[PDB]
Amino acid sequence: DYLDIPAFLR
Amino acid sequence: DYLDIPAFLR
Amino acid sequence: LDIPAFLR
Amino acid sequence: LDIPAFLR
Amino acid sequence: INRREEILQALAEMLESNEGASRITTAKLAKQVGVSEAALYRHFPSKTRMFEGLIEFIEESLMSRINRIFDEEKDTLNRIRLVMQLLLAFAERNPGLTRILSGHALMFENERLRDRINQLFERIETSLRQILRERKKSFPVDENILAAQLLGQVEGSLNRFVRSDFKYLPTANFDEYWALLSAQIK
Amino acid sequence: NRREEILQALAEMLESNEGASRITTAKLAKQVGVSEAALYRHFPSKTRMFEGLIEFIEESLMSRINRIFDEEKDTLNRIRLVMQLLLAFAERNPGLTRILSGHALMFENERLRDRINQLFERIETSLRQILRERKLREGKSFPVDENILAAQLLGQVEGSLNRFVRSDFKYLPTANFDEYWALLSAQIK
Amino acid sequence: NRREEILQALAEMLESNEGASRITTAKLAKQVGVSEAALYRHFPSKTRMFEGLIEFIEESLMSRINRIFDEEKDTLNRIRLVMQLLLAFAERNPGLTRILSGHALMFENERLRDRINQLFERIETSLRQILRERKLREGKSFPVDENILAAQLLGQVEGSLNRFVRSDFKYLPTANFDEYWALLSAQIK
Amino acid sequence: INRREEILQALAEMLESNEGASRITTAKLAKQVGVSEAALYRHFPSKTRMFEGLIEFIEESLMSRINRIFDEEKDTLNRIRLVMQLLLAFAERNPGLTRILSGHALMFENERLRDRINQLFERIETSLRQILRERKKSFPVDENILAAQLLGQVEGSLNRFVRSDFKYLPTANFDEYWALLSAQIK
DNA sequence: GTGAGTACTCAC
DNA sequence: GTGAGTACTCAC
């Protein structure tokens, strides 16, 4: 899996 | 004088 | 099957 | 007379 | 023709009153017509087009009569007097429309409408020049210069009429103006 | 110091093509290089900003009309110098001419138009007073009432100012003033 | 008679570049050649107009899915014909595909999107039922749960429909279906 | 940076809720942010530019990571799996932004924004094609065809996620999907 | 025809 | 920052 998945909402 | 002077408002 | 086209 | 211009 | 004309008549009525000194919004115009803002847009694509309706009346009213004077009246001074008096009397009979001619009412609207008014004044000035050039006795002054002076006097009269809230009537001093001038342009 | 920098900015905008449309406080603030808030620390309103320019117009024209009346005693020369003054001042101040002609003021408090009307009244009574002194000074009057002539003269000037503004400053107010003067003089001298 | 002429007009607009934006009653009325009022004598709302098209979609797809189930007994062939049906119907009806993909419905009553969701559920359970019969018919199942496979297959179709719509109908839904089928068959046969 | 970010976070919050199924008007957005409509326009020239802010995040977030996978992971199948899983997991972690990716939320806004999303998908498809072409063992299928099938599966998963009100999770069936496929593309 | 809206603007 | 506006639009 790709670990670094950006999340826009805090 | 110029007699026929148009008038827009009734 | 013959697919129907709605646009006549 | 010298006419003044406001725009300096 | 009917509802379209009702809207234009409502616009001219507002131009003629105190409201003419301020932006005529769609909200105020609709209320004057007695309909919703949305109804206005069933008869016109935009407020600019409503003003264009008034401008088309001014253009056609004035230029058809100026052309008639040019074609039907023979004498130079006679032709000039009639064109001048036509402009001043038209303004006096149509105060609201004079706010369009003077450009003040158009400040609130797209600048292309003032361009159209500029084109009308150029047409009038052209008529004046052509009338003067046909006298050739010569004038004590350049034809282009005189035409510009004549229209300038009219423009100032229109401006005074508008800024005075229609107190200073454009025709009031014309006979004296013309008596003075005509005695010199022979 | 900042007050006059705001007035200078307003006049620059009035002078450019911007003057043909509403001059917003956002636009003015930008032209000056400050925030809108900063603007409102020197003037309470846009109207007071325009009043600053109108003050310069009033003082410029009225002070010079008085000078002419005091330095020059010939009636026709007085008239020629006053008309020349109004025309040349407008030519030298295109942006302020939009204020004189009323067009730039359409966007602002109506009391500013009343103020310009009052200035024109002060100018028109001045011309009337100049014309009326001819009878005593020269034993001669005019072929028309002085009140009519003064109105016609100021109207001619107002027409030149409107034409200047309409044409985006192409039709200069002083253009061919000599020819106009020669013809006017022949009419009334 | 006029009712179907309104539906025909709506479909023509959905099919053109107009379908990428709100299709207004003013625009629809014009395309038909009547007044808006006339429109509202046959349908009470825009939503009911769209429901007319959705009915054609539902009946077209579900009737043919039933035919396939009845005429063809081989499991993999059933699957191939159902996928082919959804893809080809969309290709033959670009404007209706904007409805299937949900994009044209964004402007309308949300109950219409619920209706499309219900259609996809009816289609997905159909694929599930087809897949589940393999065990009895052939004594074999699949390397994954039938519920997962049906979702993956309908998802593949939904992707083709979205791509068709995104690309303004350039990416045809049936393009290279044979290659897709050959690979899918190798995966599950 | 601060107020600009607050507005974008408010937009993404609305996209993520039921309101995301409908036009997000300036009136509703302002109320979500807790400011006047006019305040919005001190930080953005237009609502289209607010959406562009979200689109720029999606573009940069996804393409920087896809390029990193391409440059840092060596194996073909490994690279494909990671790019696919990245897309699906990104969508699942960002439901509101998925409504932008799927094009549904953009229906209410200027069409040039959907053009930008099309450009992003073309960039992703390009990466997929390049990854596949570097295997050359050969595939049982054209590289362009496979890339389109792979992205099609992702697009359908995103669409299902959005239309189900985020019930159908995009990553849920990916392992089974990939197990099936990878056994055949060798 | 029209209520309720629509994105965006203005002076303060 | 924001109240009050601004021309123009929508489905009914």
Shortest CA distance from F142: residue in chain E: E180
Q: Are the beta carbons of H50 and H110 closer than 8 angstroms?
A: no
DSSP characters over F60-94: HHHHHHHHHHHH---HHHHHHHHHHHHHHHHHH-H
Backbone phi and psi for residue E165, each to the nearest 5 degrees, phi listed first = 55, 40
Selecting from G11, G85, G95 the residue whose C-beta is nearest the C-beta of C1 gives G85
Residue whose Cα is closest to the C1' of J9: E38
Residues 22-81, chain F, CB closer than 7 Å to nucleic strand I: 22-26, 36, 40, 45-47
Of the candidates E108, E84, E102, E90, the one whose C-alpha atom is nearest the C-alpha of residue E162 is E102
Show the tokens assigned to H64. Answer: 């920087």
Q: Is the CB of H41 under 7 A from strand I?
A: yes
Of the candidates G159, G168, G88, the one whose C-alpha atom is nearest the C-alpha of residue H147 is G159
Shortest CA distance from H155: residue in chain G: G159
Report the nucleotide nearest the CA of residue H109, measured to C1': I7
Of the candidates E86, E106, E81, E108, the one whose C-alpha atom is nearest the C-alpha of residue E96 is E106
Q: Is B9 within 8 Å of E96 when comparing Cβ atoms?
A: yes
Domain boundaries, chain F: 1-189
CA angle in degrees (0–180, nearest 5) for E127-E129-E131: 70
> Helix (H, G, I), strand (E, B), or coil: what is residue H45?
coil
Q: Are the beta carbons of E150 and E80 closer than 8 angstroms?
A: yes
CA G121, CA G124: separation in Å to the nearest integer?
A: 5
CA angle in degrees (0–180, nearest 5) for H41-H46-H52: 120
Q: Are the beta carbons of F152 and E177 closer than 8 angstroms?
A: yes
Q: Is H118 within 8 Å of G152 when comparing Cβ atoms?
A: no
CA H116, CA H101: separation in Å to the nearest integer?
A: 10
DSSP characters over G149-178: HHHHHHHHHHHHHHHHHHTTT-S-TTTTHH
Selecting from B2, B6, B9 the residue whose C-beta is nearest the C-beta of E12 gives B9
Of the candidates F10, E180, A3, H184, the one whose C-alpha atom is nearest the C-alpha of residue G182 is H184
Q: Looking at chain F, which subunits does it touch, using at least 3 CB pairs closer than 8 Å as the criterion?
A: D, E
User: How distant is the Cα of G95 from the closest Cα of chain C, in angstroms?
Assistant: 9
Report which DSSP code applies to A8.
S
- Selected for mutation to probe chain G from H125, H153, H161 (highest G CB count within 10 Å) is H153
Q: Is E97 within 8 Å of B8 when comparing Cβ atoms?
A: yes
- CATH superfamily label, G1-189: Tetracycline Repressor, domain 2 (1.10.357.10)
Q: Are the beta carbons of F167 and E117 closer than 8 angstroms?
A: no
CA G66, CA G84: separation in Å to the nearest integer?
A: 14
Flag whether C touches G (3+ CB pairs, 8 A cutoff): yes
F96 close to D (CB below 8 A) = yes
User: CB atoms < 10 A from the CB of E8, how many?
Assistant: 21
CA H99, CA H91: separation in Å to the nearest integer?
A: 9
E154 close to F (CB below 8 A) = yes
Q: List the resolution, Å.
A: 1.9
Show the tokens assigned to H56. Answer: 């720029």
For F107 and J6, how far is CA from C1' in angstroms? Answer: 14
Q: Looking at chain G, which subunits does it touch, using at least 3 CB pairs closer than 8 Å as the criterion?
A: C, H
Residues 13-52, chain E, CB closer than 7 Å to nucleic strand J: 23-27, 37-38, 41, 45-48
Of the candidates G151, G105, G108, G145, the one whose C-alpha atom is nearest the C-alpha of residue G126 is G151
Q: Is H104 within 8 Å of G106 when comparing Cβ atoms?
A: yes
CB burial readout F142-151, b (16+ within 10 A) else e: bebebebbbb
Selecting from B2, B8, B9 the residue whose C-beta is nearest the C-beta of E86 gives B2
Flag whether D touches F (3+ CB pairs, 8 A cutoff): yes
User: CB atoms < 10 A from the CB of F57, how many?
Assistant: 20
Q: Is F180 within 8 Å of E149 when comparing Cβ atoms?
A: yes
> For chain J, which bases have at least one atom within 7 A of a protein Cβ?
1-12
Q: Is D1 within 8 Å of F11 when comparing Cβ atoms?
A: no
For H5 and I7, how far is CA from C1' in angstroms? Answer: 20
- Decide which of 1.20.1250.20, 2.40.30.10, 1.10.620.20, 1.10.357.10 is the CATH code for H1-186: 1.10.357.10
Of the candidates E32, H156, H68, the one whose C-alpha atom is nearest the C-alpha of residue G155 is H156
Q: Is H111 within 8 Å of G152 when comparing Cβ atoms?
A: no
Residue whose Cα is closest to the C1' of J2: H36
How buried is residue H182: exposed, middle or buried, by Cβ count under 10 Å (0-12/13-18/19+)?
Answer: middle
Show the tokens assigned to G133. Answer: 């019969």
- Selected for mutation to probe chain C from G89, G97, G169, G172 (highest C CB count within 10 Å) is G89
